[PDB]
Amino acid sequence: SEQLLHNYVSDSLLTTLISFQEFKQQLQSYTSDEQQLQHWYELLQARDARVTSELEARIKQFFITLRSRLLRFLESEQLSHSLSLETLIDALYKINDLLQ
Amino acid sequence: PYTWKFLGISKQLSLENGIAKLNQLLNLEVDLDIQTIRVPSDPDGGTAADEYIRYEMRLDISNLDEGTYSKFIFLGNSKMEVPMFLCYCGTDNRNEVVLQWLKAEYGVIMWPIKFEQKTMIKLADASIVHVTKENIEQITWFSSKLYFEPETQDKNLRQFSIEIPRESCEGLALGYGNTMHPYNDAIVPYIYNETGMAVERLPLTSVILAGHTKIMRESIVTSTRSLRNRVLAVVLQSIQF
Amino acid sequence: DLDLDLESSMVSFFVKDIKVELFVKQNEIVSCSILDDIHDFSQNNKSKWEIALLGSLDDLELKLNHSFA
Amino acid sequence: SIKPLQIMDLKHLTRQFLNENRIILPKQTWSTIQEESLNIMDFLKQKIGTLQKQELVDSFIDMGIINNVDDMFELAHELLPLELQSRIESYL
Amino acid sequence: TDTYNSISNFIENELTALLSSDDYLMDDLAGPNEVCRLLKAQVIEKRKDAMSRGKQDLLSKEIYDNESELRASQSQQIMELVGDIPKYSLGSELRNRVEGEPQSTSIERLIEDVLKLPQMDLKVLSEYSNLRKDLILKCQALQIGESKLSDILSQTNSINSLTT
Amino acid sequence: NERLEAILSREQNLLEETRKLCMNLKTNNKKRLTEKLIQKDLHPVLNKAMEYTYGLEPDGPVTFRNDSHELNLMLNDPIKSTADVRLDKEEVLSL
Amino acid sequence: MDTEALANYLLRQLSSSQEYNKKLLLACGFQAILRKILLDARTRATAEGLREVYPYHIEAATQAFLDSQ
Amino acid sequence: ELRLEDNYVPTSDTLVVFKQLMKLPVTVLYDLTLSWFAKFGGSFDGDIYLLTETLDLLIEKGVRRNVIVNRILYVYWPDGLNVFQLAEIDCHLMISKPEKFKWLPSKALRGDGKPYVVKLQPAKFIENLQTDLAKIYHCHVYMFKHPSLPVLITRIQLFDSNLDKFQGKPLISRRPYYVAFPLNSPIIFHSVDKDIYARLVLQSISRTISERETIIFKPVQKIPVKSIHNIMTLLGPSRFAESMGPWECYASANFERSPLHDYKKHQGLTGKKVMVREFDDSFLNDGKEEPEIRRLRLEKNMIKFKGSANGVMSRYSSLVPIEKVGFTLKNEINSRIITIKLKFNGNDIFGGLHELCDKNLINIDKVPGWLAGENGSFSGTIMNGDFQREQ
DNA sequence: TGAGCGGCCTCGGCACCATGTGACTTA
DNA sequence: TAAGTCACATGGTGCCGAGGCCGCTCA
Question: Which nucleotides in chain I lie less than 7 Å from some protein C-beta?
């Protein structure tokens, strides 16, 4: 389930979509220095790994919160269609008083 | 679904002469057929003066439907008060030209034919007895349906029908005995005995034989391409004075 | 003022203002319902009255005239 | 709403054409052609926005309907009353 | 509940708009200008037919299908696991007594319902069985007392007839 | 749509349970007829009730339903109990 | 509902005598489109053998017509 | 939450409501306006007594109903009529014009097969029905008692879901389904509808009536009959049920009085005037017959078709007009089953047959019981002389 | 003179049996 | 080749809700 979200996130990352070869091929206009391009690509990898981890953290939190809230809804529905034994005991006590 | 309109004729007109004038007027050759039928072959229906003259005029052009197949059937007997009637099917506009020519050539008085209740019962009797090439008469049983449209105050009873299945009709006929008029002798008395209805008095608009024909008060429509001799004869005794 | 159905089984009437409605079988009351609620009127006394009102019809008339006073 | 046509408008428009040439339209086909009238009008307005003399007959030649102005005022003959087709003939 | 709007809104808020804004801001602050514009140009170029609303709608529909399969699973688990006596296995007067009385207090229906009362922590179950057995004894005593009272009423009828 | 799916699942579960209960009741009644009262332990005065009840199917419960209105009859009705909980005379006398 | 009513429809869609003639010719062209489309619909229905036409028939016919236009 | 309360406003066409209130008279409009403003209120500003005085000024002004219809649809409630209003106007149309509605009867069978005499606690029944139908559709139900008949007529209205259609936020209504509950009768009258929503409403009604043992509704007739009074006369809990046609004298009891009555006025002492009926076949053989014996044969036909000499009171109109009946008479003539299917059509079958009997077209001495109006509005098969109805 | 209800009635959509003909088999 | 069985596709009777004009109709 979360694999779809992970694939959607990873398929739209700059490092996964653009390689370092394409990075250097595109950025020949401003600087031809390979060291500065490598440093900028390292910064790109650091920042997109950081935001990838942060997106993973928020989607995990979203999934757990959604599952917990909808599971409480399911539990409330099941309790609505079920009967607790203590209320049955109280009703039987009232009926016992009536028969008494 | 070939509706036959019926018209009586005041004179015994002979069609084997003068039809070339009609051919010249219509610019086409008609296929006139001459037959001498003897319809009441049963001993109880008469044994003398039973011969009729049957003319089958046909505006033959092509055979696809009644738009080119408006037949004309004439029946005649010289030993009657009224000697001739015609019946024609189809809806071609040349049919009224043929009627106008017949009037203006033979000087005949022609009026439409209306059937009474007992006439309709006798016609339903006539339309099941079939003549065979071996010179025998066969009663083909059809699931009839008497259909009434009474006129009552405030339109209380608009219409009512009496459906009679085929096997019940033949059971009634065999219960009555060996007869050759099943509806008038077995079916109608059984209806009168059971439901109290005298259908010869009630307003009867049509009796429907399923798959064969459904005759009405002013027209007879038949699935079969022609009209059998018994129906023509009963129509001929119907218009007598 | 009271309302009777066709077989006089499902009825409703007011004793003073209390809407007492009854389901009664053959010459014997099998069900009762006190509907009208007064601020002085309670619910346990209501249930006790509903249980007491069950029984025969002549007994209902006698006990209703008894509790009316 | 205001721009789409109605079903009874299409009955009154093409009822005689479906009667002379035997066409049977169920209600689903009627709703479908009511939907299609909007698409046809949008396509006609996209092809021809403004109206002057030569461009309409050139477009109708490009439409594949006609081949000349003779086809124009013969098609107008079978779709207009006598005064209107005479007026169109005076216009062409 | 409304799970599908929450999923779609979470996608379109925290997944694509946040990604675009964060990518633009990080590429602007990486240094510079022309570098950022060009790199944004090709990353927009290769993400064609992938960030479109049809793709997010299909992703939301597929994750909804997965979640609905999980809902079917946990629904079977939560329906197959019952804790106490369920509904429709007990009388209508009992059910009405459970969730607020309908003012129709009938002795006969109560007797008929608690005569059909089902039987099974341990102390609650033992208390329920003891209460059910006590109510069965109440019903038995009620029928015996009614028949006895009818007999005594017939006897008193005959006695008063003789006395009068 | 999900709510109606849950409703249909509950109704189908109830239908399967009811059909299973009906088939179980039919087989249980057949087995109880076959294994309990048709054996040699049947009291001989019930041999005639069995004859019209299962042997060939009159003079039985129809006769009593005629007589209970002909005579305005009652009998000593059974004390209604469940799950083999027999009546406790000491308990009801103390009650 | 005459062709002049359809011309009124077209003018109220776009909102002297020469423009009225232009719109009347446009209405004639619209009727020509509808007649050709319905003729193609009957042609395909008769090709499949059905007596009447259906939405998929006329949708395929109009897609084939707009493919050439 | 899916149940529909009595304050929601649906999207209804203003012209349909406009032509709907045209049929109501002015006094029911007056009563409806005061009841509506006392219960729910309106966009018009004023006291309840002030609005009563305003409607009073309207009714001694003698104004036409069109003006007050425009008022209550344009200033009192301009946004739209509430569901309670839309149900109550249509129920008032049902009360005003009962002949415009057709009903279908259905017996309330239960358990073993004995019919269940249905009894309703109306407020609890409405609450339970609305909660039951709320699980499936957006349902509003309204219930009222007939001013004349002893029935309880409900009205169940179901609401559905909803080129670019712009925006409506609507809840489109369907045609309402009416189920009429007589007070103590297993027979249940419901409106003529065979779609899935009518089946849903009848199913939910059967599930919510019962509450003790499962109840199924089995339809006892498939030909609808108009005029709810007539279907209570036919299938309702009255004496005229199972005594119709020649046996309406027993249902009306006009021929015997109490045994505590004067015995000088007994039927056996004063006697009755009759005619010798000829058992020989003489009807088919036969003018200006005597006007006293003509009155006697007219009385004979009147007795045969309506049960009473003077009838239950032009004069051919029966107690209940019947639209369609079909009888399938079967006999055994020498080990052959002979079936005759008689179908009828009209506004009053047995009145028309009575008129045909008066015109000497049908023998009144041979017209059977089922043709005479016995077990009326029931179509069935006559085998061995016994009429069993169809299903 | 003017609004107005009620029988009429036809449109047409649906429901069902009825029906004629080609394809195919039997003798 | 005459007769039979078959599904098939169209013919047709009956039914009914919607709605319109009519038909007086009455103030």
Answer: 3-6, 8, 12-13, 18-20
